Scaffold this active site. Structure first.
Site, mmCIF file in Angstrom:
data_model
loop_
_atom_site.group_PDB
_atom_site.id
_atom_site.type_symbol
_atom_site.label_atom_id
_atom_site.label_comp_id
_atom_site.label_asym_id
_atom_site.label_seq_id
_atom_site.Cartn_x
_atom_site.Cartn_y
_atom_site.Cartn_z
ATOM 1 N N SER A 72 9.518 30.935 -9.645
ATOM 2 C CA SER A 72 9.791 32.499 -9.406
ATOM 3 C C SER A 72 10.150 32.842 -7.870
ATOM 4 O O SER A 72 9.605 32.408 -7.003
ATOM 5 C CB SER A 72 8.395 33.297 -9.764
ATOM 6 O OG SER A 72 8.306 33.283 -11.085
ATOM 7 N N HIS A 86 16.187 38.511 -8.288
ATOM 8 C CA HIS A 86 15.044 38.000 -9.041
ATOM 9 C C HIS A 86 15.396 37.136 -10.143
ATOM 10 O O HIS A 86 16.421 37.059 -10.789
ATOM 11 C CB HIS A 86 14.102 39.035 -9.830
ATOM 12 C CG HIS A 86 13.048 38.352 -10.626
ATOM 13 N ND1 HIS A 86 13.128 38.462 -12.034
ATOM 14 C CD2 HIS A 86 12.091 37.777 -10.468
ATOM 15 C CE1 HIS A 86 12.363 37.711 -12.832
ATOM 16 N NE2 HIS A 86 11.525 37.139 -11.565
ATOM 17 N N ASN A 88 13.500 33.455 -12.536
ATOM 18 C CA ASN A 88 12.303 32.606 -13.113
ATOM 19 C C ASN A 88 12.869 31.466 -13.949
ATOM 20 O O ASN A 88 13.562 31.982 -14.755
ATOM 21 C CB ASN A 88 11.224 33.584 -13.568
ATOM 22 C CG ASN A 88 9.973 33.116 -14.037
ATOM 23 O OD1 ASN A 88 9.964 32.321 -14.852
ATOM 24 N ND2 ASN A 88 8.841 33.542 -13.373
ATOM 25 N N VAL A 89 12.064 30.739 -13.769
ATOM 26 C CA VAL A 89 12.181 29.454 -14.706
ATOM 27 C C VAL A 89 10.729 28.923 -15.108
ATOM 28 O O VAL A 89 10.173 28.671 -14.168
ATOM 29 C CB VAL A 89 13.196 28.470 -14.636
ATOM 30 C CG1 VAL A 89 14.481 29.015 -15.067
ATOM 31 C CG2 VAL A 89 13.113 27.920 -13.133
ATOM 32 N N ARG A 90 10.121 28.885 -16.408
ATOM 33 C CA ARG A 90 8.719 28.311 -16.469
ATOM 34 C C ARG A 90 8.378 27.492 -17.752
ATOM 35 O O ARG A 90 9.229 27.801 -18.869
ATOM 36 C CB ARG A 90 7.986 29.445 -16.483
ATOM 37 C CG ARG A 90 8.058 30.219 -17.658
ATOM 38 C CD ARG A 90 7.187 31.732 -17.281
ATOM 39 N NE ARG A 90 7.327 32.810 -18.198
ATOM 40 C CZ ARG A 90 8.322 33.852 -18.380
ATOM 41 N NH1 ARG A 90 9.474 33.483 -17.232
ATOM 42 N NH2 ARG A 90 8.376 34.407 -19.223
ATOM 43 N N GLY A 233 -6.780 35.339 -11.879
ATOM 44 C CA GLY A 233 -7.408 34.809 -10.824
ATOM 45 C C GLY A 233 -6.340 33.903 -9.972
ATOM 46 O O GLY A 233 -6.819 33.163 -9.164
ATOM 47 N N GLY A 234 -5.121 34.365 -10.022
ATOM 48 C CA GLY A 234 -3.706 33.655 -9.394
ATOM 49 C C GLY A 234 -4.170 33.926 -7.850
ATOM 50 O O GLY A 234 -4.770 34.903 -7.426
ATOM 51 N N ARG A 235 -3.286 33.166 -7.151
ATOM 52 C CA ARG A 235 -3.193 33.629 -5.692
ATOM 53 C C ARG A 235 -2.405 34.940 -5.505
ATOM 54 O O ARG A 235 -1.212 35.154 -5.597
ATOM 55 C CB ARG A 235 -2.382 32.501 -5.009
ATOM 56 C CG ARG A 235 -2.654 32.363 -3.484
ATOM 57 C CD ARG A 235 -2.392 31.038 -3.016
ATOM 58 N NE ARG A 235 -2.323 30.900 -1.608
ATOM 59 C CZ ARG A 235 -1.510 31.295 -0.831
ATOM 60 N NH1 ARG A 235 -0.375 31.980 -1.036
ATOM 61 N NH2 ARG A 235 -1.951 31.031 0.596
HETATM 62 O O1 LIG Z 1 7.333 31.292 -13.178
HETATM 63 C C1 LIG Z 1 6.225 31.461 -12.377
HETATM 64 O O2 LIG Z 1 6.013 32.361 -11.619
HETATM 65 C C2 LIG Z 1 5.303 30.324 -12.822
HETATM 66 C C3 LIG Z 1 4.635 29.918 -13.970
HETATM 67 C C4 LIG Z 1 4.134 31.383 -14.288
HETATM 68 C C5 LIG Z 1 2.469 31.275 -14.404
HETATM 69 C C6 LIG Z 1 2.063 29.811 -13.833
HETATM 70 C C7 LIG Z 1 3.535 29.266 -14.133
HETATM 71 O O1 LIG Z 2 -2.782 30.840 -11.852
HETATM 72 C C1 LIG Z 2 -2.312 32.073 -12.608
HETATM 73 O O2 LIG Z 2 -3.112 32.993 -13.041
HETATM 74 C C2 LIG Z 2 -0.597 32.029 -12.576
HETATM 75 C C3 LIG Z 2 -0.440 32.951 -11.133
HETATM 76 C C4 LIG Z 2 1.030 33.258 -10.927
HETATM 77 C C5 LIG Z 2 1.726 32.834 -9.742
HETATM 78 C C6 LIG Z 2 0.869 32.068 -9.080
HETATM 79 C C7 LIG Z 2 -0.386 31.974 -9.935
HETATM 80 O O1 LIG Z 3 6.595 37.600 -8.721
HETATM 81 C C1 LIG Z 3 6.756 36.544 -8.133
HETATM 82 O O2 LIG Z 3 7.720 36.526 -7.337
HETATM 83 C C2 LIG Z 3 5.697 35.426 -8.052
HETATM 84 C C3 LIG Z 3 5.357 35.204 -9.644
HETATM 85 C C4 LIG Z 3 4.959 36.512 -10.369
HETATM 86 C C5 LIG Z 3 3.704 36.539 -11.275
HETATM 87 C C6 LIG Z 3 3.435 35.003 -10.927
HETATM 88 C C7 LIG Z 3 4.150 34.550 -9.794
#
Ligand SMILES: O=C(O)CC1CCCC1
Ligand SMILES: O=C(O)CC1CCCC1
Ligand SMILES: O=C(O)CC1CCCC1
Ligand SMILES: O=C(O)CC1CCCC1
Ligand SMILES: O=C(O)CC1CCCC1
Ligand SMILES: O=C(O)CC1CCCC1
Lengths: 275, 286
Positions: A72, A86, A88-90, A233-235
């Site tokens: 992201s 912005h 994202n790939v997941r 509980g993410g960072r």
């Molecule tokens: O694309 C991301 O920000 C990472 C994924 C979303 C939650 C965990 C993996």
């Molecule tokens: O661990 C999670 O809840 C996902 C978070 C989204 C970006 C980093 C961790």
């Molecule tokens: O937003 C971001 O750039 C980091 C991601 C957003 C939600 C999880 C990680």
């Protein structure tokens, strides 16, 4: 799909490297500093020639057990004439239901028609091999998702958004997110290069900051990824890299009609047909 | 309940004007703006906002009256004050009444509200005074009222994902209907008055304090925390935005300028670190 999931992981780590290198080359002054944690790899650039604040994150996270991994990123340029962007790939795997998600999108301040068209053209071109309707579907989804309903206002000029992607075989879905990831660089970098040297004024920075309040609002009130990260509980600092370096809010703040500040919302955000 | 509810409305509209007067008396040169509207269902609002003053950079005081599986009526005042000078705390107050119809019985009603202080460069004496006003106003209503609503304020105004309090506290209450209507109404009147008694002396005392560009930068980083609370966590804000309320009236709470930095924290042992090192986790002021 342990080998397949590790193949996705290897691609994502390389994609992060490649995107960081490409943005570093454009800026050519500032660099990405890496914060590794456990887990993930958060890379941040500040105070460059071009990028005021930029974050490119890799994360790999573990009533149902799930594994998720993705990249992201959010780039906030110093120059109001270079749009925020912005991508994202997941991949999500729920143990054996899997799906991909992602996209990229452009958030101008002082927009240029040709840039908006080029950005969408890159998106249209990358989707075409995957299906005749893929661009239309995921461009439309981008418009519907990146919208602030309580302000009746788009976040930006759009791009691609998708989620729950598993209609094709895993291999083809994986290939698609590879195309989207590469596509981000092809769509955004030429615009950065073309606009980074445009002169700007203190007043244009003030407008940029008011507009960045809209951006912050979307991410904090609406964005699903942000909300889930914070709730699960993410960072925190990795999740909130998306936030602008500075934002303003003013009571009843709206650009005067017929100003270039107004044209963004009068024309660019409402056009929704670029190619 | 019509006359009772009308009396509450009258009180709220007067309080809105009184608070605006009290704040302008300290400033002397803020520009005031007003918006009024109504809604087809019935109800509406009046928002007064003071901006670009010598003391108050952005200070909003909103009155609203809403009608909306059961039918309800609600009214209240909400305010957030963001001073120009980092040495004057941000503050917030609310007083509200809900009345909801029930089938086969009398309507259910309750009050809610509170006030709270959000310093940047906190001062112990000011925090003590602020809480003392709160404790003193609660005393006539019951021996445990301050303890209850002070504790609730600490519970509510907290950012769990940063493990950080929003401010130094005050009072917060909801679902207040354990006393007869008239006593609950007297309590929210005392809370509304109390806000002025608690905050205005601090404004008067701190408004002329020298400040620097660095202190304004810190103030802006701290205001990022404030925006986060209101946009991510605050229930009233969410409910307003979800319900199609007047956006700019709901979002008076947002700071005039905020900064966000990756991993930003003040340097330990500096004046900027005192807020988090000492003040936010003290939670004992009287
Ligand atoms: O694309 C991301 O920000 C990472 C994924 C979303 C939650 C965990 C993996
Ligand atoms: O661990 C999670 O809840 C996902 C978070 C989204 C970006 C980093 C961790
Ligand atoms: O937003 C971001 O750039 C980091 C991601 C957003 C939600 C999880 C990680
Ligand atoms: O106190 C307020 O902010 C207004 C109440 C909340 C919704 C309607 C009344
Ligand atoms: O928009 C309205 O009619 C009332 C809203 C409730 C909270 C503030 C505005
Ligand atoms: O934030 C304010 O001061 C306005 C209120 C927030 C929720 C409804 C109105």
């Amino acid at each position: 799909m342990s080998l397949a999931v590790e193949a996705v992981k290897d691609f994502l780590l390389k994609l992060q490297d490649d995107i960081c290198e490409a943005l570093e080359a454009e800026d050519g002054q500032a660099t990405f500093v890496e914060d590794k944690w456990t887990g993930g790899r958060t890379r941040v650039m500040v105070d460059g020639a071009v990028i005021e604040k930029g974050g490119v994150n890799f994360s790999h996270v573990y009533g149902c057990n799930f594994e998720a991994m993705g990249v992201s990123l959010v780039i906030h340029p110093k120059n109001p004439h270079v749009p925020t962007s912005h991508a994202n790939v997941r991949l999500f795997v729920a143990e054996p239901v899997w799906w991909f998600g992602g996209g990229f999108d452009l958030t101008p301040y002082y927009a240029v028609e040709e840039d908006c068209r080029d950005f969408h053209q890159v998106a249209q071109d990358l989707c075409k091999p995957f299906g005749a309707d893929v661009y239309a579907r995921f461009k439309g989804w981008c418009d519907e998702y990146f919208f602030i309903p309580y302000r009746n206002e788009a976040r930006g000029i759009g791009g691609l958004f998708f989620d729950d992607l598993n209609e094709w075989p895993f291999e083809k879905c994986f290939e698609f997110v590879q195309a989207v990831g590469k596509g981000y660089m092809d769509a955004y970098i030429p615009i950065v290069n073309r606009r980074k040297n445009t002169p700007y004024t203190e007043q244009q920075v003030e407008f940029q900051e008011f507009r960045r309040g809209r951006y912050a609002e979307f991410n904090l009130v609406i964005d699903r990824g942000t909300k889930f990260g914070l709730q699960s509980g993410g960072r925190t600092e990795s999740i909130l890299i998306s936030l602008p370096p500075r934002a303003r809010w003013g009571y009843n703040w709206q650009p005067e009609p017929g100003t270039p500040e107004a044209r963004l919302t009068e024309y660019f955000l409402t056009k929704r047909q670029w190619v």
